[PDB]
Design a binder for this molecule. Sequence first.
Ligand code: MG
Length: 303
Amino acid sequence: PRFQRDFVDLRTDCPSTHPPIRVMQWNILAQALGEGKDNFVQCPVEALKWEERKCLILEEILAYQPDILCLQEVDHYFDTFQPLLSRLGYQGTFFPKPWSPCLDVEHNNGPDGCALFFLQNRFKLVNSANIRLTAMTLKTNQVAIAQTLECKESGRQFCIAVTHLKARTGWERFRSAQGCDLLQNLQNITQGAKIPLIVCGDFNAEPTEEVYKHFASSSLNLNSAYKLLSADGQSEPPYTTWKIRTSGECRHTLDYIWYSKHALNVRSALDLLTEEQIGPNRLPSFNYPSDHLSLVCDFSFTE
Ligand SMILES: [Mg+2]
């Protein structure tokens, strides 16, 4: 089973008063893409059944109990995730790509896109922002959702954001422009970095790309939460996705959870799977519904 990852007690060291905020980042893998476009040559097709992956994703959410849920590649929002998660208290909003590649697949379930769930009993929605990312006025196919939430017990406001940049190789400059557009939007929505901000998303980029450099050196004072897992707390994890395609076995770190370095403490982080644990055929499989591992962290304000 995949339920073998541990939460590492982390950096805060403060006794801090308020209850933690669970934030989950995950590329749940689209069903249309997993069947048509994705080239999982080692994964059985019976493991890729929709009714099967549907339950595993639900079991993943039930296991970690997130207060906030950021998702990429959701092509079954209205079919599955919205009515079920609302029955568990989650308020959610959906924003599909204008030209999703899922439509290229024969028996597709419509467009895929970002999704943002949050416990309605824990947070009050302040403002919405469906952002179509642009590269110097050029409307891109990619999409982001920014929202301000108020803690009903504290009154502390903060912003969460979910995105999914341009995928393949040869789009580094394109992704870099996409990231800059999102940064400019978040700088406006957070009222000039006056309110804390958390950014989840499949950036489709290694830490070496310029898009990562822009986020790491942004004036929003952001930091990658999963870096704290490393020995120095300065290194991005060795992977966030691991799969074998027609091209070959692929192991990349593309998922991130950015946060206000000055206003947010990372209480914990769900550690990764070892090679012996993930199995030889890698992700996905009978025991995991996606080629991406979910990122889960506990956040907390600095007082
Ligand atoms: Mg994918």
